[PDB]
Structure formats: structure tokens, C-alpha cells
Amino acid sequence: AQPTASTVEGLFKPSSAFADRTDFSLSSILQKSLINRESFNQYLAMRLAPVLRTFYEDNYDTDIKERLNGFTADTDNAFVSQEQNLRNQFRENYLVHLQTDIFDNTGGNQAAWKLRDVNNKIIDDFISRIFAKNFVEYVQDGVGPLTKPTKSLIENTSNFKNIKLQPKFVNKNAKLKINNDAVYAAIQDKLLDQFITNENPNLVSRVVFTNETPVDGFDNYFNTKVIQSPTPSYQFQVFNKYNQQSGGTKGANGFNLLASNLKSYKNDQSKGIDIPNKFSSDSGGKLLLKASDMFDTFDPSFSAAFIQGYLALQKKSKGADSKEVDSLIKDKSIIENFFVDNNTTVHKTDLVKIFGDKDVFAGEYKQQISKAVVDLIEVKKDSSSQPDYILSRGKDGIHLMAVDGGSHYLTESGRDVAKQKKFLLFRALQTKYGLVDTDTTYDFKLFDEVKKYFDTNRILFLFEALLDLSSDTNNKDNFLSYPQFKKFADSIKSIEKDLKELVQAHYKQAVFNETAVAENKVTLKLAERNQPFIDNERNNQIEQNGLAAKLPYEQDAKTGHYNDLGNYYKDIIDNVDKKGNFSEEVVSKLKDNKKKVEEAAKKHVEALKVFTIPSPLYSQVILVQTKLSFTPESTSLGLNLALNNYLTSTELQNSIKLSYFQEDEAFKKIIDITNLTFSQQSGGTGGTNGNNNLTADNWKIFKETYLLDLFESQAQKSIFGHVGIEGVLDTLYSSLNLEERLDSDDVIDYLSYLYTAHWLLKDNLKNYKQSLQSKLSRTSNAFLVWSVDSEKNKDNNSDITQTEVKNPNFVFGSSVYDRYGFRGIVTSSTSGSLPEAVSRRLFKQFVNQTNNAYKGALFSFGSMDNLKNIINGIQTQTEFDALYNHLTSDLNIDVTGVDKNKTLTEQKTSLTSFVDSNFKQKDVFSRFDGYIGDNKVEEKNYTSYQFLSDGGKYHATFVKQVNLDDVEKIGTDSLKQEDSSKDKRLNLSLEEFLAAIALEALDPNNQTQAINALISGNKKGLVKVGDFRIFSSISAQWVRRF
């Protein structure tokens, strides 16, 4: 089957270089690919599974020996099937697509496919068999591990040292068929420790008393006249009071059976805390609150309360009240514990002051709630002791939680990961032999949890575990010293000097990435939980809150981060740092490790001596190769796979777009693209001369406008802190880690906006003039509007349009507890951002029926003869219809003698005659620069301005008039700092003009035009690409084939 010539001519032609820039060379593209997490893991698979091939090779078991032969046979059969189906599908040109859509993604060779699928099969099998057995044991000396250790033997802190995750019949000095378990128990105890290290997986024994529908009746608690038809939930939380007659063990009865003897559920020998299942409404028991999905799989009020207990052990918990076990309110309902004293810290929801002079509660709630209200309190055995039990109410009722072993492996110095691993191994041993108490059930499988967390990094984590295994030369009891695994442990030894410098950094940064991702969920989900209690206050439904209480956790005004809740993850990044506020520490140690990955990847690619192999027949990729590696073929294919992932990735596309910015010398004079810092600092480097004459602060306002446009699109706007907005904006900017991520969408969009802002600023605003001309019109007034919403209407003459509206629409939380308004040049056709009230007052009700009220109405024409030159310019009937309606229904100018029945000539003739005979010079053509509301006044006379009124709300609006008589007048002298040149920029100041230009730059049409200018205005032309994976990845608007 000779392939047809059409596809052969039409297929991509591989070249010597991937692209034609100084950052797209082999030594740079391979380094960047090895820094890409997904690409790096695709490489590590091919550099890690050759290590695990040796274990299958020297293994005693006949089955494991035959696994390699079976994998090769299955690979041959799969190749036969692939060839058969490709032939039956493509016929004439099947070989071309066999090399194109299969081999290129695989390594570019027939044997490349077999070295991919076999090398993945063996690593998958080795991954499965690590966790195929349970090895948590209490090891006795001279008889081996006891088949069933006794309860009193293992439930001791001093006896934790004997729970070491060791196999049963493994002898170092013997060739045992099942000696391979000595491998897994060594790797598992490594992987498990990673699980103990990164996830910080504390166990919590918790009891939840679900929300109770009150048989007493909600009217007793929450009156219907204010709260109609309550439903059992957090906001209306009620439990039937404790009665001794009914023989119940849940609700207040369960809380009485529980809190009376609360001190007796901590097994002080084991330091663990075990609370009975029957005392909880659900199945009850213990849950694993690891760092990753504890704010995902469970309620935020639950996970955050567990964190509060976590730091309560470590004397780091803040904001919560403390009361002893004996002080618990068990006779009354449970909620009475939370009505804490108000007289004079602890963050208490004083609902008496919150609801003001409105009756929201009734009966016992009204009498109690005076007395503040909280959500979480700390209950402890003794006044001198530290809080071991935490009581908090969430979505599904009130939970009493206690971390078990917290006094053991969590102290003021931080988390003790060795003790934590020992304690969780003790719990896993408890579950292994059914040695738990009869009144509790262990829904706790540590091996399943470590397997599920480790399976995310199925390649990096296993490789790092092996490296740390071979990094411990002082421990002679590992499987490395077993003569059965002498060469296998040598294979792990042949990968330290080569890759470990890179893999340690990659692991230490990926774990930090996951830790930052998980700790972002803290401030994300706490805000999500607090969202309805802000919605209620927004909708004037504050009374719906009822029993809603603010959590004790403090937030950062300057950062928008929960510091104490971040300590739970700081106790992770302080552990992965030693391997080999949390916000500041992680932001420092992510860049200090990203530079380490840069260095390690560059050294690894250097030491590999990478050269480009010529591509095979019908190939469309630029493959690479190496020879300075322990297994040259697998390392070459690993680099091939890492490249196949990076070239198709959006990181390389954003790198190409980054290079297009690199080329533009005009833009690079004002920015430092790699540094993402505005250039020229502050001085005379190019200052002052034409061609975008402005400072570097003059670009900070463009950046701030971009940040505000991004902030307005945020799903939640309180995850970034609060007061004003100049701080929240830089916090949002930091949150993007743009300088740490130069090959992201978040940076190409930022730079696209920045060159949109410059492409309106260059050539003496040659494109800003065009945008304004195509936006403005002569028959419609245009304004620069500073419109603020005043919920209250009016020397006590402070301007309210220049006073910052902190927390507008309650966007930075709630106020009661814990020159602005600019819209740019807004016209009638584009008045979406303006409120309908002010937009109608400007572009449809300029001169209301209630003098200077006509000033600026026909300023859209600017001069006397201008509207005369436009009225006779009408050719058709509808053209005059629009003008007449605008002059009457919009510009409210009285018309005399006009007739609809007139012909085309007389139609315009009557209007021209009446315009001339009515305006034979009321400052109608003057420029209106002042306040518009219920009345109209100038800027100077703010003492006589009536705010616009609409639907009970008020608006304060400043408008500066803009016509085409100043759109054309912006030119070379438009960016000068001088005040006398303000007429050269729409009679604006420089800052106002640049803010308007930035708002114009946010236009998608402006950005598209400026980006096409960037690509077309390239000194070297469009970037060429020699690899198809770089051509298909990014659109032809940026890259061209050779």
C-alpha cells in the first residue's frame, strides 16, 4: 500500500530547530519540559520503571519473572492488533498515520511504542503490588510478630516503637520466594511517611448531634412574624431539651451521657481519644482529615474546627473561648454551651447588637441571646491542660471532635511526624486484627488512604521514595542490604547521581504546590460558608441569619489568608523542606525551589548530552536522544515523552506568545518581560522624549485597571483581603504568581492587555484616536463618568465622589461585625456599566422636565455649523427619523413646523430652518464638566448638587463632556505632564487620561487589534515552528511552518 502523495506533501515537515528564537533551543526546550510537571512525570516514568525492571529481573518468584515475558507477548499482540485496525481503517496511507498519530506521541519509533507500553505495564504492576498486602505489625523478638497482639500491649505510647510496618517471614540472609515483601514494607513506610508528611493526616473522633426538628415548636424559638417556616439547619439550630424520663442516647440526652464523663474517652496510655458511636446521630466514629480533601469531602465548619483543635494542642489556636469538661451545659440543650458571656480574645457573634431593635428570637433564645453567641468553643479536661475536645456547630448539627494522639504527636514545637506515623500505625494495627472497642467501629484504612493519595503522584512519589531509601546508607535493615536485591538496590544507586538532584527539587516543589492549593481552599471554603450570611444582610434579610455565628478564625486584612488555619500546612512545608505565616513561607519556598528546579533541570540536560536524532520516514516531530544515562534507550524515550507533553502543552504556546512580546523593542523599553516589571525604573532612561513619553508609575495604573477588571470577574472577592483597593489588587496580582509562571494563560492575557494599553499610547495615540472616533458620534453626547452609589442622600460639604467606597455591595464582608466611580468614555450605545438611572439621565434625559440645564446638550456637535452640516446630510427617510427622534425624544429640543408628510427635501429643510432660527447666536455648545443628578451643577459648586434618585437609592455622578472636537485633538503633546497641555488630552489630567485609555484597552476588539499589531509588527516576522506538536498546539496566528 503505497501512501498517496497528497498527504505526503500535506504533512508537516520536521526541522532542525523547534522554533527560531533564543529560548527554543534543545538545551532550553528540554530543560523547560523537564521543569513542566506533567512532562517531568512523563519523563520520570521512563526513568523510574527501568529501575523496577531489575526487580522483576532478579526476583525469586517464577510469576514475577514471567511477568516481563507476558508483558512483551501482550505488547506484540497489541502491536498486531494496532497494525490490523490501522490497516483496515486507512488502507493506502496507513503507515504515514502509524508514524504520525501513534509513534510521535510515543517516542518516534516502532520499538519506542514497545518501550513505552512495557515500561508502563511493569510500573503499573509494581505500583499495584506495593499495597497488595497489610504489613502493620507488633514485632516480637525471637518468635516473630505475634498473630494477634493484645490490646493493653499496643495501646501505649511507649509501645508505639514496635509498630514499625514490618513483614512476617522476611529473612535478609536467605533467598525467600516471598521476601519481596521486605521491599514493599520498606517502600510503603516511605510512601506512608510521605502521606504522613504532606497530607498531615490527623484522625478525629467526632460525634454529631444532627439538627433536631423541635417538638416544642419553632415559634417558641424563632417567631413566624419575622422568620417564616424555619427548617432545621445551622441558621435555626434547635435540639429538644434534655429530659431524664426518655431513654435516649442522642441529641441532648446523648450530650448528657457524653459530656458528664468526657474525660474518660482519652486512653491516656495510648494518648488516643475514642468516643462511642451510639452517642452520634450518624454512624459516628473517626475520620481522616488530611490536608488535601478535608475542605472538599467534608463541611468547611468541620475541617476548620478540626484545625482549631489541631492548633489547640500546640497552643496556637486563637479566637475561641475555653471552658472545662465539667463546665459543659448538658442539662439544657446543647446550644447553651455557645451563648458565651458578653461582658469584658474570642470572636463572639453578638446577635443582640447585630439585629439591633428587631425581635428575631423568642422564649429561651430571646432570654439567652445579654449574652453573645459563638460557633466553636474549646472543652478541655483541666484548666491547666490544653483543649483536647472542640465543640462546633456546622451544617448538620453540633459536632464534638477530638484529634487522637494530638497530645502525642502535636506539641508547641510543631508536628512530630515520627510520632504521628507511629500513632496512625497503631490505629491501623487496631483495625487490622479487630482489636477496637465494641462501642466504636473503625472506618479507618490507612493503606487505602496512602494508596489513594500516592496514586496522584504515581511516578514522582515512588521515585522519591526509592531515592530516600537509597539515601539512608546508615540503615542496614532495609531491602537494599538484602543479597536478594543487591542489583536492584544498585539500580536505585545508579539513579541518585543522575536524577536525584532534580527529583528532590521536583518533589519538594510539587508537594509545596499541592500544599498551597489545599491551603487556598481554607480561605475559599470559609468564604463560601460565610457567603449566605452576607447574602442575607445584602437582601435586607439579616433576620434570616438567626443563630448564624462567625467562626473564631481570624483573617488577614492585608493578605486575605487564615494564618492559624495555615499553620496546619506550615507544619507540612516545614517537614518537606527538611526532606533531603504559611502564606509568606510558601511563597518564598516555592520560588526558592523553582530556581532549584531550573538549576537541576539545566544540569540534568547538560549531563545527558542531548542531541536531536533525525526524524524517521513520514515523521512530523523533532525527536531528541541521549547516551549519558544508566539506561540510554529509556532515558531517550523519557525525554521524548516529556517533549511530547510540553510541545502540545499550553506552556509552550504561552512561551511563543511571550517571545512575540520579547521581540517588540518599543514595549520592552517600558517593561521587563521576564521580570514582569515596568522598565526605566524612575529617571531619565529615555525620559523625556516622544514615542510613549511617560513614567513607570504611569503604567502601574494600567496594570491596576487590568487587576480591577480581573477582580470584578472573581467568583469570590474576599479571598484576597480588604481595606484600600490598591492593596487588594496587588494581593490578587501576587495570587497569580505571574513572575513564577511566565508560560501561563494568566501572563499572556496580562501582557496582551499591556500591549493593548501601549498600542493605544504609541504613535501619539494613533489607535486611541481611531477607537474614540469609531466609538463617539456627533449626534450623541459622550461623557467620562465618575458614578458612585450613595445609599443615603444629602461645612459638611465633603465630596462623596472622591471618598473611597470601602466594601461596596458588601464585598469585603459585613460592616456591622467582622476620584472614584470612573467608567471612562461612556456613550449611549455602550452605557452598560452605568446604572440605568444615571445612563437614562445622561443619554436619554439630559434636560429633565424640571437656565444652564441645556448646556452641553448639542455639545456632541461642538460648533454652531456642525449640526447644520449634519441635518442636510440625510439621504433616506429613516436617517432623518433617527435624527428627529434623537433631537426630540432624546435631546428634548422643541421642534416647530416639522411635518411627517413632507418629502425628503422639506423634511431636512424645516429642521435646518428651525435650527438656524432658534440658535441665531444658552451655552448649548459649551462643554459640561460637572455634577449631574436630580439637578445639574458644575464641579466648583458642589454645595448645590442634588443626587440622582432612583428606587430608593441615590447616585452621585461627575461627568466630563467629550466630543470629536477633542478626539482628533489628542496627539504628540497629549501625554505631556504639563497642565497647559490638558486640552491635548480630552481636557483631562494625565492620570485620568491614562485610566480612560486603560478602560478602552480592556475592550476585546482593542486587544485583538493590538495583538495582531504585535504579531504583524514583528522585526523577525512570524515565529516558525519545526515540530507539529508546536504547530497544532498554538494557532497559525502565531506560528508558521517552514
Short mmCIF file of C-alpha atoms in Angstrom, two decimals, residues 2 48 76 107 166 240 253 257 328 377 472 492 505 549 580 736 762 778 876 916 918 927 984 1039 1041:
data_model
loop_
_atom_site.label_atom_id
_atom_site.label_comp_id
_atom_site.label_asym_id
_atom_site.label_seq_id
_atom_site.Cartn_x
_atom_site.Cartn_y
_atom_site.Cartn_z
CA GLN A 2 1.99 2.96 -1.30
CA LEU A 48 11.89 5.14 37.05
CA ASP A 76 3.46 -7.95 20.47
CA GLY A 107 8.91 8.32 21.02
CA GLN A 166 7.45 -4.84 59.04
CA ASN A 240 -35.10 19.10 72.13
CA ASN A 253 -29.63 13.01 76.00
CA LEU A 257 -24.36 10.82 78.51
CA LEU A 328 -20.37 21.89 79.74
CA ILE A 377 -15.56 26.55 71.85
CA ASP A 472 19.74 6.17 54.01
CA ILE A 492 18.38 2.65 42.70
CA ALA A 505 13.55 19.59 43.90
CA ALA A 549 -22.25 32.82 64.15
CA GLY A 580 16.68 15.67 51.55
CA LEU A 736 -1.35 34.67 40.12
CA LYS A 762 2.11 54.82 20.78
CA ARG A 778 -21.73 63.76 16.54
CA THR A 876 -33.23 58.50 3.34
CA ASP A 916 -30.93 78.37 12.36
CA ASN A 918 -33.70 79.08 17.11
CA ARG A 927 -18.52 71.65 27.43
CA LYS A 984 -4.42 67.95 24.17
CA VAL A 1039 3.32 30.19 14.26
CA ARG A 1041 5.58 26.04 9.19
#
